[PDB]
Ligand binder design. Structure first.
Ligand SMILES: Nc1ncnc2c1ncn2[C@@H]1O[C@H](COP(=O)(O)OP(=O)(O)O)[C@@H](O)[C@H]1O
Ligand code: BEF
Ligand SMILES: [Mg+2]
Lengths: 50, 210
């Protein structure tokens, strides 16, 4: 009742969330200088960290 | 700051400006990196940069805007334009661009484009929906190019004889078949002079290869 079991599901979810917050900090630091109508939401996020 | 004022100015005024800005010893390097450092300093203390040139798209995806006086050569003076502009405005190789540009940070060294203003001396809205070059329908020349100036100088008679032997018009192909030692350089010079004096509305371009 006090011990909780975790599976591949929420473990992978937490790992993906860590990757997501990392790339979110990255894209926010990059976005602090970006302007309007000069980019697409494709190269703003890098797939390599995920 | 505009680019052409610093491009077509003599290098002496550039040396004076770089010495007045309190910079490194400027006269010890190329004109290219001289004007590059001058623009960098003026951007560090000043407003946005205003550049212009002709666009070349490589096989890489991005584009380089190069100036006319350097015969469109690589160097620090080129302007990097991302493929995002080539996707938005649907740019093409050889597009005469002029607009706002910014200085580079780490990882970059070329001035990145901020916002285009004039594309081939035309508004981007008018240039968006246009007609391709090869899609046009060629035809024969109808408007004859008058090469006689009317003053009758000592050498303009050459052009006169030209009008006597080869009536040139808008859309004609001219092949000057001449061995060396024959005096075609001043001939082409006088032709250009006359065609700019009589028809100053049409653009005139010359190309000296080898
Ligand atoms: N219309 C002209 N009047 C006087 N001299 C001329 C004329 N056209 C050519 N020449 C002479 O011919 C020479 C041609 O020199 P150059 O330009 O090197 O030959 P090319 O044009 O065949 O390369 C010049 O030195 C010039 O003195
Ligand atoms: F005809 Be010369 F060699 F320019
Ligand atoms: Mg010659």
């Amino acid at each position: 009742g006090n011990r909780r079991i975790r599976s591949v599901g929420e473990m992978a979810e937490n790992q993906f969330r860590v990757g997501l917050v990392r790339v979110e900090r990255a894209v926010k630091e990059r976005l602090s200088l970006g302007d309007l109508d000069t980019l697409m939401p494709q190269d703003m996020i890098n797939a390599k960290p995920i | 700051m505009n680019l052409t004022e610093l491009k077509n100015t003599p290098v002496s005024e550039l040396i004076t400006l770089g010495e007045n800005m309190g910079l490194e010893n400027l006269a010890r390097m190329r004109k290219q990196d001289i004007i590059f450092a001058i623009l960098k300093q003026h951007a560090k203390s000043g407003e946005d940069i205003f550049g212009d040139g002709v666009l070349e798209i490589l096989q890489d995806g991005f584009g380089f805007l190069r100036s006319a006086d350097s015969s469109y050569l690589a160097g620090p003076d080129d302007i990097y334009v991302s493929p995002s502009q080539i996707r938005r405005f649907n740019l093409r190789t050889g597009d005469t661009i002029s607009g706002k540009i910014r200085p580079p940070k780490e990882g970059e060294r070329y001035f990145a484009l901020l916002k285009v203003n004039e594309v081939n001396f035309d508004k981007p809205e008018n240039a968006r929906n246009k007609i391709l070059f090869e899609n046009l329908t060629p035809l024969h020349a109808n408007s004859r190019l008058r090469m006689e100036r009317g003053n009758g100088s000592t050498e303009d008679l050459t052009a006169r004889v030209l009008d006597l032997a080869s009536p040139i018009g808008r859309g004609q192909r001219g092949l000057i078949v001449a061995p060396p030692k024959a005096g075609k350089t001043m001939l082409l010079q006088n032709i250009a002079q006359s065609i700019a004096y009589n028809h100053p509305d049409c653009v005139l371009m010359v190309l000296l290869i080898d």
